[PDB]
């Protein structure tokens, strides 16, 4: 009885979930469609079982790695932080984390590293997103990206992370004050206006890299290169050219891939420009673009003019616009034939 | 069948699906409404729709290629003007659409710098 009930409710869940992936506003929380008569009740067990079985199913598909990982990500969005898929990928992350920990204790790194390898496969594809959802193990992401993208050996990190002294509660106060001075006394646009989410991560990477070899430049070096890999700085049209904002490269993403972030920057700039010319006197120096938890917000200094710009609407407007512009493209492209 | 659907390019999707049909033909030799055949032919409509999308996407890529080439050469000429002459204002706002170049996304100038730098690298 359980096998039939699970199969039926499982396919129902998967269909109503594909609806959420393609469409919107489907409410996959717990309460689904149980009117199948055969499916009957939904236990909470299915959605966890659904995520697990579907993730393994994707693993067993025939496609190349690119489609597999794009699909894992296009499933990682979106459920309402239940989390079913979010918790599946999350326990994968903590597995990689504990595994690299055990490598640290062990002194060398064990071969074949299954969890680390799977994490490398998934995260290579959208560095910012995996990190964003789990704002806890940024340390592991930093170390892995040191391990593979950059050329350093996964042996020279092992000692330095095994050789560390315990910060012993004393030199830290000095360390908190430290995060605060190189931050304030930095005057590099991105670090100073630190956009917020990224500030919460930022604190980590700095403290991590410092415990490695000679630091406090290497530390700022890595932190700045990371913040460069993760937030556009929107520069002003004026020839100074003073920065007007730091809006995070993850949240300007139209649709689901980062090529899209790029395409979206081309929406936000058109928006910031129309404002400056439209309301004459709002010289670029005056305008600021300020984010929040999840919103790209845009203000001239006098509080009067202030346009919001949000993941949902920016995304979906760009989606329809690209859609029927691509329609026009097909039309006159096939007009040749 | 889901793998046949989820291919990168819908061409390989369609030919792999057609091969799977030609094979199913052996084991299930009666064309009819075998539940597996129902699954298989929603798959055919599915790959047809995916091919529709792929045609549209390749056409948009064609349009972007022409727009990028044209606006790219326009940018480069108006930039050589700044290099030789003065006071040309290469900021964002450039020599606009003649009839057919494009609205000048911000993407071009970054693309322009990158492609031109590699181009210089490839010179003789």
């Amino acid at each position: 009885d359980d096998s039939m009930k699970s199969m039926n409710k499982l396919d129902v869940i998967d269909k109503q979930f594909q609806k959420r992936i393609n469409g919107e506003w489907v409410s996959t929380d717990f309460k689904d469609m149980p009117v199948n008569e055969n499916t009957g009740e939904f236990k909470h067990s299915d959605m966890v079982n659904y995520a697990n079985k579907k993730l393994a199913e994707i693993d067993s598909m025939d496609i190349p790695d690119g489609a597999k990982d794009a699909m894992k990500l296009k499933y990682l969005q979106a459920d309402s932080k239940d989390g079913a898929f979010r918790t599946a990928i999350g326990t994968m992350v903590t597995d990689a984390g504990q595994e690299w920990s055990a490598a640290v204790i062990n002194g060398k790194l064990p071969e074949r590293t299954p969890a680390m390898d799977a994490l490398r496969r998934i995260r290579n594809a959208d560095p910012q997103l995996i990190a964003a959802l789990y704002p806890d193990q940024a340390e592991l992401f930093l170390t892995m990206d040191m391990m593979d993208k950059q050329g350093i050996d996964p042996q020279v990190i092992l000692d330095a992370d095994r050789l560390t002294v315990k910060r012993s509660k004393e030199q830290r106060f000095e360390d908190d004050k430290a995060f605060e001075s190189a931050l304030n006394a930095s005057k590099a646009p991105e670090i100073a206006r630190m956009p917020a989410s990224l500030r919460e991560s930022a604190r980590k990477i700095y403290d991590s890299v410092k415990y490695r070899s000679g630091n406090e430049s290497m530390a700022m070096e890595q932190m700045t290169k990371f913040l460069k890999e993760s937030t556009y700085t929107f520069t002003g049209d004026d020839v100074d050219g003073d920065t007007v904002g730091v809006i995070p490269k993850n949240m300007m993403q139209v649709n689901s891939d980062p090529k899209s972030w790029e395409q979206g920057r081309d929406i936000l700039e058109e928006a910031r420009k129309g404002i400056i010319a439209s309301n004459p006197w709002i010289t670029n120096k005056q305008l600021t673009m300020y984010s929040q938890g999840d919103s790209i917000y845009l203000m001239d200094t006098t509080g009067q003019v202030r346009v919001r710009y949000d993941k949902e609407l920016l995304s979906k407007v760009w989606s329809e616009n690209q859609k029927k512009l691509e329609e026009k493209a097909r039309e006159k492209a096939l007009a040749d034939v | 069948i889901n793998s046949a659907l989820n291919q990168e390019d819908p061409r390989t999707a369609w030919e792999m699906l057609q091969g799977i049909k030609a094979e199913l033909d052996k084991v299930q030799p009666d064309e009819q409404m075998t539940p597996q055949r129902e699954w298989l032919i929603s798959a055919q409509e599915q790959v047809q729709n995916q091919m529709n999308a792929w045609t549209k996407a390749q056409a948009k890529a064609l349009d972007d290629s022409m727009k990028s080439m044209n606006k790219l050469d326009v940018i480069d000429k108006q930039f050589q003007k700044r290099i030789n002459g003065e006071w040309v204002s290469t900021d964002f706002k450039d020599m606009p659409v003649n009839e057919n170049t494009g609205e000048f996304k911000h993407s071009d100038m970054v693309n322009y710098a990158n492609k031109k730098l590699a181009e210089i690298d490839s010179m003789d």
Binding site: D266, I267, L325 | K105
Partner: peptide, 13 residues
């Protein structure tokens, strides 16, 4: 404008 693509359009809407 209202019913246009062209970048402007996306920002406006």
């Amino acid at each position: 404008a209202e019913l246009s693509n062209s970048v402007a359009g996306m920002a406006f809407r």
